[PDB]
Design a protein around this ligand. Sequence first.
Ligand SMILES: *[C@@H]1O[C@H](CO)[C@@H](O[C@@H]2O[C@H](CO)[C@@H](O[C@@H]3O[C@H](CO)[C@@H](O)[C@H](O)[C@@H]3O)[C@H](O)[C@H]2NC(C)=O)[C@H](O)[C@H]1NC(C)=O
Ligand SMILES: *[C@@H]1O[C@H](CO)[C@@H](O[C@@H]2O[C@H](CO)[C@@H](O[C@@H]3O[C@H](CO)[C@@H](O)[C@H](O)[C@@H]3O)[C@H](O)[C@H]2NC(C)=O)[C@H](O)[C@H]1NC(C)=O
Ligand SMILES: *[C@@H]1O[C@H](CO)[C@@H](O[C@@H]2O[C@H](CO)[C@@H](O)[C@H](O)[C@H]2NC(C)=O)[C@H](O)[C@H]1NC(C)=O
Lengths: 50, 151, 50
Amino acid sequence: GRIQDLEKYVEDTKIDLWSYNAELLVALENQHTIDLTDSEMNKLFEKTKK
Amino acid sequence: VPDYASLRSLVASSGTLEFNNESFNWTGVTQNGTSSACIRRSNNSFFSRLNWLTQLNFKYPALNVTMPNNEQFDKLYIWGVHHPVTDKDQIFLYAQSSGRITVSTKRSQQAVIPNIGYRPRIRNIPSRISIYWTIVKPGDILLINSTGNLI
Amino acid sequence: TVSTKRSQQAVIPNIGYRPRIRNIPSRISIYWTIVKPGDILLINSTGNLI
Ligand SMILES: *[C@@H]1O[C@H](CO)[C@@H](O[C@@H]2O[C@H](CO)[C@@H](O[C@@H]3O[C@H](CO)[C@@H](O)[C@H](O)[C@@H]3O)[C@H](O)[C@H]2NC(C)=O)[C@H](O)[C@H]1NC(C)=O
Ligand SMILES: *[C@@H]1O[C@H](CO)[C@@H](O[C@@H]2O[C@H](CO)[C@@H](O[C@@H]3O[C@H](CO)[C@@H](O)[C@H](O)[C@@H]3O)[C@H](O)[C@H]2NC(C)=O)[C@H](O)[C@H]1NC(C)=O
Ligand SMILES: *[C@@H]1O[C@H](CO)[C@@H](O[C@@H]2O[C@H](CO)[C@@H](O)[C@H](O)[C@H]2NC(C)=O)[C@H](O)[C@H]1NC(C)=O
């Protein structure tokens, strides 16, 4: 009953939070890498032109 | 309801209130017991889904009864215990002073002693009903042994 | 009756005809008492004790 119900809550709480949390982490880094790569392209680009 | 919040939550989690009758070998009992407390069709009554048991003829055989579950779905059983107010009330209802209930499965068991007690009368009733719930898995035999006081 | 200096437990046996798993009409109720050092757990009984 009641006790069991609450740790099912606790479980789902954790998984949901982590799932979203991980989802953001992933997406933020992907952007960061794509930024860093083309920025270094831009940096090399500038180095030549400068 | 001892652990009220739990039972409520479980029935809530079911989402159904489908009920089926069963003819238990309730024998030597004055069943279909009434009370003016509960009024139906301007009559002395009791709860719908439940059965109150009283003694027949100043006598009460102990109730040694079973139910198999040969089916492919779990049976949620609901029963209660009466709390008689006085020793005089006790002998009137169940004709034996010592009350005792035992229910069991193959996988769990529960037993409760009635506590004869003078309680504050909500709606002019000096008594209460204690409600428990026994789940049964298939291939198990819900059995009940009692001395009375059994809903 | 069992006890510590810091906690106590007591149980009454409920004589009952329960269903016969493996042709046994009886059960055994199991509890567990932790004891801290400098405590003297005692076990008063009338029987029925494992
Ligand atoms: C009410 O009491 C009766 C008898 O006092 C109980 O009957 C016993 O119930 C068990 C199962 O609950 C059965 O045991 C079986 O016994 C036979 C013959 O010894 C054996 O071949 C099986 O392997 C099995 O163990 C049996 O029906 C019966 N036992 C005996 C011999 O008394 C019963 O528990 C209660 N029944 C009701 C109506 O609630
Ligand atoms: C489980 O169910 C069985 C149903 O047969 C109960 O067995 C019967 O219980 C009574 C308890 O009072 C036993 O004693 C009898 O007492 C009366 C009056 O006090 C007396 O007239 C009898 O001579 C007898 O001593 C009785 O032996 C027993 N069986 C029979 C054949 O009726 C049992 O008590 C139940 N267990 C529980 C609820 O703990
Ligand atoms: C109480 O009395 C009635 C008298 O008709 C018994 O019969 C059942 O009545 C209920 C409604 O109270 C119906 O739901 C059932 O369909 C009736 N039974 C049958 C087999 O048709 C009732 O059984 C009595 N109480 C008992 C013995 O527990």
